[PDB]
DNA sequence: TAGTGTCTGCTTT
DNA sequence: GCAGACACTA
């Protein structure tokens, strides 16, 4: 019974966590001093937010982790009354902690929690701010209401760079004693596109299916991300080359047309080297194609016509 | 913490022996911990409303078979234990039990 | 006492005509039990419902409909929860033990048929539930999918169900059936009346049957022993006379906007649907050889655009006026 | 008893004046009521298709068809929320209206038609404004009138046949009701003013009313009542042609658009459109009459008229495929001012 | 340790970050309330989150109660709040305790909000001698994505159904975000209180730009205090993240029409507006706002072609069944054309809400009038004409025919 | 009993060796299960590629007789509300295995049709209850899935099955059923397959039912085209040649004759026309744009409904106008 | 004394 | 982002 590489090597201390060096160092000073304020952590999923919160709580508590934490997650009875009662009962107890230490309550995935529960949470924090503390884990801070964000410190998380992910990959490779190649690691980074969990899963698939980590094996087990192919084909000059690229990539690898349309919409929204008028015309054409596909006409001919219209408005005859 | 205790009186504890995984070697001084969800006990509460004798039997795998006797009919129910105890709770269960 | 549409509905698989592949497959499946899921699609009034009803009648028998065959349609509520529970239940009901009379009177197969009429009016979640249910209960339960439009049906349903395309009933496809119906009902027609009726209703035998019934009723009411002509059925159907179409073409050819506008106003006062007018104008323009290729291409595109606009449910006056103005300015 | 439409309503096939061929067609259909197929009536508004349906029902059944009864019942569409339909009842037949919302209309028709069908000497129901459907109740109709074609006969009356899907037109007989010519409307007006013993200085006033109404019997009768009551039952040749305030507002907006082409003119036109739509008036007919009012201006040339009619068709398609109503009218008017100069 | 915003809680009235005009207005309103002749039965104080709402009442009741505890805050259900209100009704003499309704009970359900409304109506119209003072504090913040009022924007107008607000015995005083000058002064006060810890680290020489950025970035005093505490506690080289605020309904239209001064490029501004405020820009009756407000770019003095293109594009967007791509395309087109025509822009017109509810009310009035006309006509004799033909023929001819006869 | 089921369900694979085409995925998952390591596999691909069949074969291979009480199969046919999902999967994963010393596999067919909150609860359970319980995600659409789910689950892509897999499955079916097909019929079936096995099995069953005797005969391309209704390549070539050569009269006559003699549909005809037109070269860069736009509008109109003759004439006119540039 | 900063709009169903 | 009117000391 062997745990997967994602979960077998979960960091237990803040030193093992890589990525935002300044934020990790700040968390280390918070753990050492003990002054724990209310925090909200948001960013790209799977970059080490919940893991960082757990490591900070462990380093702050030690032997008090048995009772000093109330980890209420999304997969729970997250109502308005039972949650309020549970948090009130948790906040109306005292334990033998040093004066510089406080109880920590972790609420992972607070975005999906109901707004009435958010108001109850605000009432609990206002009533029992002196004893317990709250640490939030989420992907974006938009879903958290403004008054709750007012009573906390927001620490935005950025995407992990090449250096941190590569360093973590090297440590895990040294721990597992697995032969690797620099080109294979570069391919793993390119396919991950800044994701740590995805990189670990891809490395595990490469070592299980083929052994040695090579770029060819990584490309064989998993294809390149579709946003990159969408961006490559959208900025193509000639219509024939873009048509051939979209066909030979998306239809040969088996990509759904609605997924292609959604990815193209996201790429056009995030595109930079394009004029505003061209961008809005392409957005309108994407919306028309999306409506056509959603109604039921999602053949390759619709995608080809969409590319033809995009190239026609790009060239302007 | 809620503790309901069944005493050693033979009126309600006529037979109780702890085995060592061989079903023949009875031992004394060994503790068995069973982590069961509230749902199964709530479902079984109605089944035990009218009965004469209730038999409890679980193995090292954690699955629990409860026999209900009420000649009368026989009702046997099989249960499932949780995957793992919460952290290291079982220690504090005994530490409160001889407390 | 019964309209000819319902009175002459084919109750047997040999009564339907102009359908070779589907009828042969069903007939050969009558002696076996390897019946796949059928996706019935085609033009409206082609005979998919009649075909599935005949297959169900010849498969089990009148007694097994009450306890073995259940159909879905738009007549009742078809919400996601209701459809899910109903379809899962009826795909979980056991195969009813047949009586002896069914056994030595009909070749009863060991499965059951679930009929999904007008399946194009179903949501994506309902279709996903249906396809998952029919995969997980493919043992002794079968699903029949009937829809006018294939595109509205999701791709997995089209992949899992066998595609049985229903060819449109042209003049030569249903001329024999119309002749048999006329002979059975004692209807007298001239040489080229049934063909004209079939040409009026392109791939639609129900419309032709209704037109024939109306013509027969008119002939019976008139009293004299006369034969029905093409003019009578054309005017009952709603076909614009050729003289008025020629006048419309002449008005369009002339470069006067006021004359075209007043002619369109009078035509709308006549209350004639512009779809038939568009079809007749298209037939006249493509059939005529007095026009060049470029003008024919442009007018075909304009008529296609006007038909697409009319199919959405717009004001017929504005669409026909715009089409005539665009044609006159070509 | 206080209107021309109700007092002098024909109640028989022989009582009908215009469309003798249509009367013969209805007589032929009523010759064998048992073999009557499903009917679909399409034609101009105000022609009298409802009158033909009532005459056919009276011929098939007899007395008591024109006697109507009122009953009310509620249909549940979501939770405890229910919407009531003002269904009108009658012996030997029945009539309904699609006054409900576009989404609950389908289930209301489903429940009502399932209740009416039952088992059974059939019952005939008239479907007023069958064209005003969201392509959802039409599936229920095409299923029920095919499966339950033993005791129910749906009768469909509508002004436009294009919104009706092809299967419904296939299963239902196409009945044509052309609007009467000027002579027939003039004869009807002469008869009804003879029966009302009102003064008539000349016969040209009836012709003017017929031309103004544009082949609409209801509009002609209401205009005749207006001129009779305003002039104390003494018609005059110099009496002005009375028109409804809606057409007057449309014409005034057309003149304002032709005269002034600016942004303030655009916002006042938007305000007028909002006020007009506040009167429960559909936007499609508003755009249609605005187009006809813009097209009759002699100042505009052929190119401007062609551009206006093209934009009108495009925005009619947009309104048909859209949800809101103000946007398409506003775009049509703005495009008209853009292409005018 | 203890939080700065709790340790540095104000003691005197001058410490509260409140405007002089706002302080005078709330003082006058309260003083009017405490007289035996009560002009306003309840006091409603809306506003954004963390604009020093509750503290104003707290220190005001601290300074005024001995003149003639401090407050009675209701903990956050239905019958409990009914009992709390009834008990507050019987606290008038020898105590003079103000009744605070901060952190109001759950209103996201229909039943509890309705019973709250009837409780408010019952207490507002109670003809009982004397009156216990009562203050209601409501935080204006929209609920993110998870109808008809709640779940779109949580504010005073959402909870109260235009009846409590339109009452003589109420004084609605909306609160503004904390001023930049007041925020800077309070941050400087915190710094001169924490001089020792400030001199402990190398943060005193790099203080002015941080204080200015914190004051100009957010209008919440509590969030600013928390950010200052986090920055001071941190060793250094750590970027500061603030409490991201919200954009109002009219603010979104103003940003779409004119643009944004902070971000000159339109693409990034549009992307940020879509990401942060997807609910506002994807919910209905917002394209109507653009269609009614685009005329005020130059008081209706721009080209007719741009307006025609705008409305045509809006029609195409409406044709896409309200897809997010349609909204993005429409907003981008409007922003692009206004940026193009902004070469000559001055004296922009004021904006307004689109007149959509009035049209619906008039349509409902027309419907009920038509129903009454059908009822009376059917009672008089037999007359059915469906509903479509009424507005075209019977909506005008029948009224004048009946009037003349 | 067998031999009374549709060929789609009759030929359902039961072992990993019975899954053709995706050799790399099969080898990778075999290597994963040989080491006792199941890293929350996620399967993505077009329908008919063999996702649920592959997971069923894998569960049979690694468990055997434990499928009845260890594998929890959830799908669109079962209610998957937020409360239902959290309760059911929490109860299943939190409970320890009965006697087998192996990971617990949960199969979630059609995972794209769940709410966002249900997906969040599922992704929390995946990371929380993972000591003994693993998860399988099956979905043809990735835009309806939370991006967090795609990170914790290893994504495997199911490519359309190549010609070799289709040919091998056809040979196996012919061995099982004692049937013969011409090489031209095999090529036509390869062309019509479009990377789908269910369609191939369905049309093979339909063609076998079409034959008057299953034995002592050979299946040609003509019977396949007649039963499936697909137009012949020669018919499409003749129609295209008539369009490109005959101006408007005899071209329309030829199109009507082609559509009337065999009753071909317009959608398949235009699909074939554009399929051959894709092979042709166009050194103008503008004719192709007009062709694609006009053809897409034609398909949209046909989906919305209309007149077949008018649509066909529109196709002819659009092709002629585009080729006149 | 004219700029800079800053309150108030502008929302009802 | 806009305007209309007021705050506040140079
Ligand atoms: N900086 C890191 N260094 C090493 N491993 C990491 C790092 N970040 C993430 N991981 C790995 O990724 C796994 C998932 O991390 P999580 O904290 O659960 O992701 P997340 O940031 O909370 O985002 P979610 O869970 O999708 S909302 C961890 O258990 C680690 O194995
Ligand atoms: N092959 C056929 N031979 C004889 N009559 C036929 C045939 N196909 C259809 N009909 C006639 O068509 C009428 C109705 O047939 P249906 O089966 O309801 O058509 P349809 O395929 O169901 O069209 P829908 O339901 O609108 S898609 C009846 O009068 C049948 O007799
Ligand atoms: N100088 C200050 N002026 C005002 N408040 C201050 C000051 N210094 C610290 N604070 C704190 O800032 C907070 C302001 O309280 P309020 O905004 O009135 O409460 P509130 O209205 O409930 O805020 P929300 O909207 O619920 S987050 C209190 O916690 C004060 O203790
Ligand atoms: N690799 C394969 N080799 C042979 N037959 C296959 C293969 N993959 C799929 N099939 C056939 O396809 C049938 C249905 O495939 P399924 O796996 O049940 O559906 P699916 O491919 O998962 O598509 P969906 O829409 O996601 S259920 C099986 O019963 C097999 O007969
Ligand atoms: N043949 C006819 N002779 C005389 N009047 C007629 C005739 N047909 C219709 N009408 C007139 O039409 C009016 C009713 O029209 P209506 O049925 O409402 O038209 P629609 O069916 O288009 O709504 C009646 O007042 C009646 O006087
Ligand atoms: Mg996490
Ligand atoms: Mg049918
Ligand atoms: Mg407060
Ligand atoms: Mg599957």
Author numbering:
A (entry chain B): 7 to 323
B (entry chain G): 202 to 271, 302 to 330
C (entry chain D): 24 to 353
D (entry chain E): 1 to 120, 134 to 354
E (entry chain A): 63 to 130, 146 to 153, 162 to 231, 237 to 495
F (entry chain C): 9 to 333
From the study:
The 9-1-1 DNA checkpoint clamp is loaded onto 5′-recessed DNA to activate the DNA damage checkpoint that arrests the cell cycle. Rad24 replaces Rfc1 and loads the DNA damage 9-1-1 ring onto DNA to signal DNA damage. Unlike RFC, which encircles DNA, Rad24 binds 5′-DNA on its surface, not inside the loader, and threads the 3′ ssDNA overhang into the 9-1-1 clamp from above the ring. Here we describe the first two structures of the Rad24-RFC–9-1-1 clamp bound to DNA and nucleotides, in closed and open conformations, at a resolution of 3.2 Å.
In one conformation the 9-1-1 ring is closed, but in the other the ring is wide open with a 27-Å gap. We found that Mec3 of the closed form undergoes a 45° in-plane rotation away from Ddc1 to generate the 27-Å gap in the open form of the 9-1-1 clamp. The third loop is hook-like, projecting from the Rad24 AAA+ domain, and interacts with Ddc1 of the 9-1-1 clamp in the closed state. This loop becomes disordered in the clamp open state. Therefore, we suggest that this Rad24 loop controls the 9-1-1 ring opening. In both closed and open 9-1-1 clamp states, the first four interfaces (Rad24:Rfc4, Rfc4:Rfc3, Rfc3:Rfc2 and Rfc2:Rfc5) are occupied by ATPγS and Mg2+, and an adenosine diphosphate (ADP) occupies the last interface between Rfc5 and the A′ subdomain of Rad24. This observation suggests that the 9-1-1 gate opening does not require ATP hydrolysis by Rad24-RFC.
